[PDB]
Amino acid sequence: AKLETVTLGNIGKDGKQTLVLNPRGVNPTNGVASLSQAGAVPALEKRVTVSVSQPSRNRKNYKVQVKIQNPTACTANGSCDPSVTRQAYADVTFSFTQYSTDEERAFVRTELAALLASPLLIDAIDQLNPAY
Amino acid sequence: AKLETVTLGNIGKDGKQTLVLNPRGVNPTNGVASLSQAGAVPALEKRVTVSVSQPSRNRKNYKVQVKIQNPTACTANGSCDPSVTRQAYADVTFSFTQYSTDEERAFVRTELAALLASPLLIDAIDQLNPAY
């Protein structure tokens, strides 16, 4: 769709946070859309990127992929410009066949959304302990 | 957490569907837990897999990855039994720092859950048209 200003609500550990994301355009060389967290500094802000690809010479399957990049900063030692100390990464990859149905696509989409909130993935992500 | 029988609700194109995935145990060689929707034939059934890796000697980053595999079948292309005709793939990969905070991790978790429901990603996944 249009690269609008998206606002994700009910986010965070508590679920009472929000995150505002203004559009950042596409990259006409990479063919990848990007948008960034509504923050002052481009270096400090989190970003997410979405891309869809037509089939080609490698494989003739459709593939869409989103990336997330959330850095964090410190102020006490540089006391002037906060610098990034560590980052947090996220990357998905969807791949459907040329004969994939519309419903097949949405099912895998909400399955991931619901799978991101299941008790199993809570300790898999936040406490980082596997299924046992 | 514990490998119980997870049931995802509010799933599908409509958003009023459900998918049940009973546990199938862990694979202590691959280090991947796996669980699948209970189906007759092993090839036909839906499946998802979760895995976490501690920082080894090669790379000192934490990495957790979940995969989704939804096949589709037909009862009339092979005029006796059902054959798998097409596939649908999904897999995410998160990677946080050794000094990463607990809340940072959950933020990337709910951000992806909400990002999978934003109007923009609907057309990226369901209609497969980039942001324009």
Added chain:
Amino acid sequence: AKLETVTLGNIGKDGKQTLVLNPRGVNPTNGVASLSQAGAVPALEKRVTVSVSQPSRNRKNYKVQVKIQNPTACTANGSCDPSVTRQAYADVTFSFTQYSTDEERAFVRTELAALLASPLLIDAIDQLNPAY
């Protein structure tokens, strides 16, 4: 112009058919806008694509090209996912001079549309017999 939903009417062998083509966005890498007849499966759908390129360092000629791709399917023996058996292709290529006049361009444009309806081109395309 703007990437609108284009609808060609009074189309077909009889000339009393219609074809609806919704926009599907642009591809900033290929430099091609594309739009397709709205269908469930991407492989089944009809498609048309328009592209213009300005004269660069390679060649100092203007060139605009539209492609047409109409597949056909079968609902039998598979009766689950219809498969595309054969296709029908169309591709034009216009190239005018950098100093070409506005009127020159439209004349070649309406000439092609009118030439597509001349008695001669009907039997060249529909009856597949050369001029003899």
Added chain:
Amino acid sequence: AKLETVTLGNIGKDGKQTLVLNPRGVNPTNGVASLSQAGAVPALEKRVTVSVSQPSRNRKNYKVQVKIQNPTACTANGSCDPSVTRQAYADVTFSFTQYSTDEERAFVRTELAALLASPLLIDAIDQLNPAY
């Protein structure tokens, strides 16, 4: 069909122009039909060429291709015999499957004729601005 004298009406940017094209024979070496703008001079005249080909050693499909070439002249540069300053080019190529149906063929034919009159292709050809 027969190589008759075709006359395209309702032509040009204005839309109330006409163009008369007498038959010009075929090219018995290239196997391509040709016909030319009704006028005194062979160099000055606009021309179009139509060709249909049976399947052979390269590919076992069918291909029909028409070209349009409209040059333009000036009298003052040589004040005696007008010389061509620039040209205007048009080239289509249709290719249907060996198993193609009659109705499919005309459908791709009228689609291009109607596509040549849709607002979108007007600004792509006359103002040379892509779909946006």
Added chain:
Amino acid sequence: AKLETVTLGNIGKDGKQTLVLNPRGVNPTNGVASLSQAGAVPALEKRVTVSVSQPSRNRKNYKVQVKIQNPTACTANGSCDPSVTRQAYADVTFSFTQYSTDEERAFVRTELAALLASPLLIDAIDQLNPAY
């Protein structure tokens, strides 16, 4: 933002002119978008080009540049086809630091926008006499 058709009003020496500029696409090699006022002959028409940067490995500091190229031609010399004799050129280059805030950025913009209308720059651009 998105490449729409922008129309500048209150323009020119008089201040009672207007200029309409349709989009002309991107250059995936140069990474620069371009758009031009719709004119009869492509050579005579005005055009302007916009380009920004994105986070890569070479330089993380941003640079944005817009170019203006307004040519003019003469017709009465050969009564064949008017030729472009001279142009008028303009290019800006903004470059902000990686840690630059949005509010800082707009200030440099409106400073330049207002500076283009200040009495001092009036005589530097229109009358071509220096500040002394």
Added chain:
Amino acid sequence: AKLETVTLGNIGKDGKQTLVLNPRGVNPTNGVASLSQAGAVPALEKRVTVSVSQPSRNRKNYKVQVKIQNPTACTANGSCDPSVTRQAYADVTFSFTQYSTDEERAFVRTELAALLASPLLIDAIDQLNPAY
């Protein structure tokens, strides 16, 4: 014209700011006039520079160029005197032919002035979004 004290109004992101730039003389070696916004510390202050050409024997094409340099500083790191951390750069270059007309020159001038306020440049400069 003469280097007076220029004051730009209706400036900034909001459009409700103003910027005063007092003259700071000419550069008799570089042949470039310069003037700057009167600020406390000379490094922190904004500045702009204007330069043209004059009739000499080397090349007979005129060139006028304006540059903008708006830096920004941070004070809290050395707890003594703020240092400049980042700048914002802008430079245009106009170049008209020896036979250029007065009216042609203003056209390129107001086109650039209006083009910096067009929706296309809105995301190109402030949001650093390409035309796509």
